[PDB]
Design a protein around this ligand. Structure first.
Ligand SMILES: NCCNS(=O)(=O)c1ccc(Cl)c2ccncc12
Ligand SMILES: NCCNS(=O)(=O)c1ccc(Cl)c2ccncc12
Lengths: 293, 293
């Protein structure tokens, strides 16, 4: 089957609520690509917004290249660069947890991608390990960590005036409950800080193999986000982080205390993760757990 | 890191009790391979037996090529051809179940691999969807189904005299409980028939998305194989297969009734799956569910 005139569709490599994702090949140059298919339906988030965001971030490190957007029958198709598995996929290969070294090194790369997004005036809003994918097996950037999936980014400040959006409440909960900021749970408008806090939740998940609020109780969908949020507030940071380098507690702490429109101090956050590597007497190399025996 | 003199180790692509599996490249010709690493320990099944079996089946359709076996430090390494994902991996991509068409077409290929093994005088004994993998994405046999993992095959008849091994009992349960023959549960010695029956259990699993005896009760490891076995005996075939083409019931039935040393009638079994395709007014093409939208 051939879409976008010169793109051949292979087999499924991903399937989510937002559609199916196939591996494919560009018939002109034979480059490998991923073809996202979204069914055209009332409630489904436009795939065109994602294409626009990819174009906006084009040229940014760790953001894949986009190649085509169009409609094919009852589907919208977005063609991106083919990438490797996600950090969640690799967890299943490493015992369901990562070592401090891998977390600190990944953190530095994951933190640089989120900052890049913020500098383009967007807030990600869907921070999760399933969205950070690494390079293709035999290529230059096989150990580079990429961010994908921009279906729910939003402008947090007018792009040209740098005017920050106002603080609103009564918002409806969006992304994955497991990693969201406490604020998102209280229905408050999400900002830079919230991305930074959701990333810190992802970091502790990497470290412990699980979070205190996973698999809660027998209740309805809205009750799950409620109880999880309460648990997140009852679990103190020193306990959540007990047993790992102080730098992780310092990160969770900074992230949770940022004021709504405050510009995060990315260099401080990055230095934290550097101190972690120093203390282990190692450098930032490409010796991630999934490359080790 | 480099093993076997000229093989470079990449990243993990699999991890089981039997060790880790890395993707790699042969430095001489740049062919892609999978490098299995087994830790050298008392209770661990020799990896050399697997290499011998691969060499025995070399040249057989759907059996990967083996390239090297040796010891590297505290590990034994087996280097095989790099393959695609397993039929269990692809289930997660297709809604956790396959259509009659995909099951009948896969069945025909899975059945030919098991027969090939039997004709080399071996019985597989570890039939499961995790062991049937398809080809690499961009290659000639991307839709060919392969069998891998020969750690528990056994000779069921002296290879030269065709003398069939005797019927023994009091055997200790081996493979995955979910798919094993009822006989395996009763501690009887496994033969051709048992492979055929475990494959039929895999076929119904593909079809229904699950089996009646999955996730049983709160008890010890030996009780799990016991209760599951009882359930397997209490679930009548017409019920297990209710709702799908008769050919599936006919298959489960033939397989369960074979006598211990009886030679299966493979052409009958293969014809069954052909009738299934005829009735759907389709041929045996490469339109598996994971290639469809
Ligand atoms: N599930 C493991 C990694 N692959 S995936 O198909 O889910 C996937 C989802 C979303 C996007 Cl944008 C991708 C881009 C490239 N490769 C896989 C992509
Ligand atoms: N888990 C999905 C498919 N790949 S795998 O690494 O587990 C795997 C396990 C065992 C063998 Cl022999 C392989 C051979 C080739 N490719 C993957 C192989």
């Amino acid at each position: 089957n051939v879409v976008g005139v010169h793109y051949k569709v292979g087999r499924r490599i991903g399937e989510g609520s937002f559609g199916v994702i196939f591996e494919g090949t560009n018939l002109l140059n034979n480059q490998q690509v991923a073809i996202k298919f979204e069914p055209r339906r009332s409630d489904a988030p436009q795939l065109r917004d994602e294409y626009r965001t990819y174009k906006l971030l084009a040229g940014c490190t760790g953001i894949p290249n986009v190649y085509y957007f169009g409609q094919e029958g009852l589907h919208n198709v977005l063609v991106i660069d083919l990438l490797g598995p996600s950090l969640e996929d690799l967890l299943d290969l490493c015992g369901r947890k990562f070592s401090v070294k891998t977390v600190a090194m990944a953190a530095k790369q994951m933190l640089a991608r989120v900052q890049s997004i913020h500098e383009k005036s967007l807030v990600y809003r869907d921070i999760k390990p399933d969205n950070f994918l690494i390079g293709r097996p035999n290529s230059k950037n096989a150990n580079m960590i990429y961010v994908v999936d921009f279906g729910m980014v939003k402008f947090y400040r007018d792009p040209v005036t740098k005017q920050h959006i106002p603080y609103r409440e009564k918002k409806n909960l969006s992304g994955t409950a497991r990693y969201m900021s406490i604020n998102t749970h209280l229905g408050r408008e999400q900002s830079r800080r919230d991305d930074l806090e959701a990333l810190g939740h992802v970091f502790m998940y990497f470290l412990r193999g699980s979070l205190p609020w996973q698999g809660l109780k027998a209740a309805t969908n809205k009750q799950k986000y409620e109880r999880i949020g309460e648990k997140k507030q009852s679990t103190p940071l020193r306990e959540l982080c007990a047993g790992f380098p102080e730098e992780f507690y310092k990160y969770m702490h900074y992230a949770r205390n940022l004021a709504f429109d405050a510009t995060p101090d990315y260099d401080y956050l990055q230095g934290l993760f550097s101190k972690v590597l120093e203390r282990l007497n190692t450098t930032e190399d490409e010796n991630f757990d999934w490359n080790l025996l």
